[PDB]
Design a protein around this ligand. Structure first.
Ligand SMILES: COc1cc(/C=C/C(=O)O)ccc1O
Ligand SMILES: COc1cc(/C=C/C(=O)O)ccc1O
Lengths: 249, 250
């Protein structure tokens, strides 16, 4: 448990080492989704699985989320991207760190897709877990996570997601992002994981992205939901097999 | 007045100057300086005073790592600047006297207003990029920023900038992502581009191309002039004047 500073916004994070406390291991940065945080069941499961195969984990609470600074309503993808650059720059100064990996769920899955492209030289492999990768396009077309609006007259505030508020700025920012450019720029190995009864983010976009990527493996979680209600073990298993593969090379 | 606008704990220094008049209700132009610049530079002040003279309030703002605002120069990126601009807009929209909101900006601030205006396209009435540095994302993509050559695929941790300044490589990683042409396409209200045709820092011809891409843009060339209009600043202000009186008359 610590704080990484990002322009005065404290980002809360958890560095978990393998039990053996090795002097050298790789690091995976893990990013939760919209209204999420680093202690969610699926985040912890992935983190624990990694730790048992020798990968340190750095789970970071993004702007306005978890125990980080900022209000939820003020968060945007530019801020999240800025935070991720700050967490990478922090990881780069850790002595124990050999290679750096990225994983993340939903909005956090999208965010690591963006952020690995931007850090393409640095990030050895990428794990988007049910990435909300259509957020930008659907924003341009007038919806955000179930809520609709005129994409040319964005409201000042959107109220939804169980008592939360969100400034229209979120939408103004998301609309600018061309996700496909980021996908074309990251040619290193990608595992996308996705449940095919996902209610929140549609399975079929992940199929479309797995194919755009130069080197992407798509693992389907049969019958499963957005946060893997039914089969989280199938996700942890997927991540385990992929990463054993990657740390061997 | 002078004031600080909070942007997530980063204080942004700004100047609100009224048309004096008052008046009771009037338009407001946001004015954004360029890379290593600030709100008290000659060319910025001059444009500011001209607007004030024809009835438009001005809100000049220092961006992250610049002028009197918080943060280090080497830590600024275009995403920080844009985020800063949306906080300035959010502040402006709360001012009771404000009728219409315009944007203007010089060089990197010219680029920033091209981007921000598209993002705020329902709010911003007209747009004035002054010698906009709108090639920055393209030359970041090619590894040719600041008289340097670097691999755009293996960006250095730190680049040397103007006059002993440093610039982190994050600046580049962020700039490579921005497709200026998308933002140009999305802003279909009146634009006035101004550019001097002996511009040392930012090639004139790029502004020709952008001016044709925009649905409604007038380009005013300043023949013989430099990046900061060392010779014919008069012409810039006169250009801004006539465009704006015309926009006020609509
Ligand atoms: C559909 O309602 C919701 C969707 C999400 C999605 C989060 C994400 O994609 O990261 C979060 C909270 C909600 O209440
Ligand atoms: C960051 O690299 C550059 C920045 C600028 C911006 C200049 C300005 O805003 O005055 C111009 C040329 C460059 O190569």
């Amino acid at each position: 448990a610590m704080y990484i500073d990002c322009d005065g916004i404290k980002l809360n994070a958890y560095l978990d080492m393998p039990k053996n406390n090795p002097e050298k291991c790789p690091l995976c940065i893990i990013i939760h989704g919209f209204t999420g945080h680093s202690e969610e069941r699926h985040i912890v499961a992935v983190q624990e699985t990694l730790n048992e195969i020798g990968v340190a984990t750095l789970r970071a609470d993004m702007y306005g989320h978890g125990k980080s600074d900022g209000k939820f309503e003020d968060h945007t993808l530019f801020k999240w991207l800025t935070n991720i650059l700050a967490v990478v720059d922090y990881a780069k100064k850790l002595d124990f760190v050999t290679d750096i990996y990225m994983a993340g769920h939903s909005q956090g899955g999208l965010s690591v897709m963006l952020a690995a492209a931007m850090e393409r030289d640095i990030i050895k492999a990428l794990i988007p877990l049910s990435p909300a990768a259509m957020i930008p396009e659907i924003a341009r077309t007038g919806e955000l996570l179930g809520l609709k609006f005129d994409p040319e007259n964005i409201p000042d505030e959107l109220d939804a997601w169980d008592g939360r508020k969100l400034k229209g700025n979120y939408v103004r920012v998301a609309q600018t992002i061309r996700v496909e450019d980021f996908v074309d720029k990251y040619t290193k190995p990608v595992l996308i994981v996705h449940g095919d009864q996902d209610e929140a983010v549609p399975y079929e976009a992940s199929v479309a992205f797995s194919k755009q990527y130069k080197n992407c493996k798509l693992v389907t979680i049969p019958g499963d939901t957005h946060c893997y209600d039914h089969h989280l073990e199938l996700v942890t298993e997927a991540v385990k097999e992929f990463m054993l593969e990657q740390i061997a090379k």
